[PDB]
Scaffold this motif. Structure first.
Motif, short mmCIF file in Angstrom:
data_model
loop_
_atom_site.label_atom_id
_atom_site.label_comp_id
_atom_site.label_asym_id
_atom_site.label_seq_id
_atom_site.Cartn_x
_atom_site.Cartn_y
_atom_site.Cartn_z
N UNK A 23 0.84 -1.19 0.00
CA UNK A 23 0.00 0.00 0.00
C UNK A 23 0.88 1.24 0.00
N UNK A 24 1.25 1.67 1.20
CA UNK A 24 2.11 2.82 1.38
C UNK A 24 2.97 2.60 2.62
N UNK A 25 4.23 3.02 2.53
CA UNK A 25 5.18 2.87 3.64
C UNK A 25 4.55 3.24 4.98
N UNK A 26 3.54 4.10 4.94
CA UNK A 26 2.86 4.52 6.16
C UNK A 26 1.34 4.40 6.03
N UNK A 27 0.86 3.19 5.77
CA UNK A 27 -0.57 2.94 5.64
C UNK A 27 -1.29 3.34 6.93
N UNK A 28 -1.11 2.52 7.97
CA UNK A 28 -1.71 2.79 9.26
C UNK A 28 -0.63 3.17 10.27
N UNK A 29 0.30 2.24 10.50
CA UNK A 29 1.40 2.48 11.42
C UNK A 29 2.66 1.74 10.96
N UNK A 30 2.64 1.26 9.72
CA UNK A 30 3.78 0.55 9.16
C UNK A 30 4.99 1.47 9.05
N UNK A 31 6.15 0.96 9.43
CA UNK A 31 7.39 1.74 9.39
C UNK A 31 7.76 2.13 7.96
N UNK A 32 8.72 1.42 7.37
CA UNK A 32 9.15 1.73 6.01
C UNK A 32 8.12 1.30 4.99
#
Length: 49
Positions: A23-32
């Protein structure tokens, strides 16, 4: 058939709960860059808990 067959959240229209891959490096709380969106809590982080 306990009470309600359909609630008012993501579970209503979510025929795919495995897509969680990128998705995105910062979807919800994902780091990189995208990694895991299910490794945060026990229940789905949808509209409600």
């Amino acid at each position: 058939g306990r009470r309600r067959r359909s609630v008012q959240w993501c579970a209503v229209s979510q025929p795919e709960a495995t897509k969680c891959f990128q998705w995105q490096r910062n979807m919800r709380k994902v780091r990189g860059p995208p990694v895991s969106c299910i490794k945060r809590d026990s229940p789905i982080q949808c509209i409600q808990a």
